[PDB]
């Protein structure tokens, strides 16, 4: 941990000249207010003001005034600064009256965690699995369409292809205070995955943001381009952000039950049922972009139906074989483009809603591949995820459970942003249309 005096001590010792007061907007982009080291005490006194309307993105209508409340435990010094050291602090957004801002994603996740604690669950342990692609750049420094390598699942090409710009990312993250579990090559060419050790929800989301920033910076250093696009190329695997979750009550895993046949408590089953029913409503948050639904197509391991299974090609919820204190519920819908705070908040709220109402878990699907007809699917009661952003937005509006998780202020602005994005997307004439038509007609 850290204290004010500790932060000042390292800042003086490390010759830190510039401090980034980082925060996140509703779209998951990392925003900051740069600060000279002479303003560190003022920042630590929670007295810096900024617009605060920058959270709303490009749909902001009026400038507000809001305070940055830095989190001392998030202090870290970037290693690539070299000459003039630059540090960062992750801050919460507070209204001038003193109350937290309702539109801050970190505050939203904190509020959902608080109402979880109100039910006796001290913490929510989260381990994400973000995947990314590496693209070669051109002379101007822009990404091309060529992957950095042509490796496969768990492949090993030590020279410049297998690891390449992945070993140094892990090393830099380790120096940053990250706890890296393992790294490997992903299924699609040029796709890599780095896993962290499990942490609490807020720390997990902060680590996801920092990880994305660090991966992008290091890839740019090596003359490459790193992207967390859900589906950058057609016909190859997309990138997912599988989230492993387990509720805890005083260092006790409440999902574990040795007496159960599958080693799953009734609390875990209620959690899974709640996540399953509200899946289509959460889809607009866990899959927020237009490109997110090009990944949710059959044949590339992405889930396409709302169902759970210990072993299946593409289940929406997977239960790993680990038991004891590591019994987990894995949700595979989210992509790395999602906002980690909002995604974790909506998933936790859906699970808590499942717990509250003692929801009944539907039967798991067997090795029965979904080659079955739509009549078989709706006869067996297997819902499907939204086919595009518009359906997800309609379900989001219609839902009263996870819209409460978002809150009244954030829901309206997120909905406005996503409607604008979809409206600009739907009126475009793509090259595919000009290829099919313009000669045949």
């Amino acid at each position: 941990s850290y204290t004010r005096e500790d932060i000042i001590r390292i800042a003086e010792e490390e010759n830190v000249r510039f401090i980034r007061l980082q925060f996140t907007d509703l779209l998951g982009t990392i925003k900051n207010v740069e600060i000279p080291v002479s303003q560190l005490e003022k920042a630590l006194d929670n007295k810096m003001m900024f617009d605060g309307s920058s959270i709303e993105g490009y749909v902001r209508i009026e400038e507000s005034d809001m305070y940055l409340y830095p989190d001392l435990d998030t202090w870290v010094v970037f290693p690539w600064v070299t000459s003039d050291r630059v540090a960062r602090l992750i801050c919460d957004i507070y209204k001038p009256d003193g109350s937290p801002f309702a539109g801050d994603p970190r505050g939203i996740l904190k509020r959902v965690l608080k109402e979880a604690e109100e039910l006796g669950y001290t913490s929510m342990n989260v381990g994400p699995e973000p995947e990314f692609f590496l693209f070669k750049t051109d002379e101007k420094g822009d990404p091309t369409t060529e992957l950095n390598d042509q490796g496969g699942y768990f492949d090993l090409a030590p020279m410049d292809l297998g690891e390449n710009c992945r070993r140094e990312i892990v090393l830099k993250l380790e120096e940053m205070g990250f706890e890296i579990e393992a790294s490997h090559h992903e299924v699609a060419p040029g796709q890599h995955e780095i896993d962290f050790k499990y942490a609490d929800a807020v720390k997990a989301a902060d680590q996801i943001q920092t990880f994305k920033l660090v991966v992008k910076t290091i890839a740019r250093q090596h003359g490459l381009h790193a992207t967390f696009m859900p589906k950058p190329l057609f016909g190859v695997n997309g990138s997912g952000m599988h989230c492993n979750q387990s509720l805890f009550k005083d260092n006790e895993n409440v999902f574990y039950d040795e007496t159960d046949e599958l080693g799953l408590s009734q609390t875990a089953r209620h959690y899974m049922a709640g996540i399953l029913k509200h899946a289509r409503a959460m889809a607009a948050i866990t899959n927020p972009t237009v490109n997110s639904y090009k990944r949710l197509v059959p044949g590339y391991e992405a889930p396409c139906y709302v169902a759970w299974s210990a072993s299946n090609r593409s289940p929406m919820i997977r239960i790993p074989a680990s038991r004891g204190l590591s019994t987990r519920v894995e949700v595979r819908n989210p992509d790395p483009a999602a906002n980690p705070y909002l995604a974790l908040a909506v998933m936790l709220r859906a699970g808590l809603d499942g717990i509250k109402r003692q929801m009944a878990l539907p039967a798991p699907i067997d090795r029965n591949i979904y080659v079955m007809s739509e009549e078989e699917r709706i006869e067996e009661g297997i819902p499907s995820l939204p086919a595009d952003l518009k359906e997800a937005l309609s379900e989001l509006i219609r839902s009263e459970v996870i819209s409460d998780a978002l809150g009244d202020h954030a829901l309206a602005y997120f909905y406005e942003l996503k409607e604008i994005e979809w409206d600009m997307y739907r009126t475009q004439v793509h090259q595919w249309e000009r290829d099919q038509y313009l000669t045949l007609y």
Partner: peptide
Amino acid sequence: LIQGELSRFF
């Protein structure tokens, strides 16, 4: 299924 897995031949 296994569409992105069979990309080695494509």
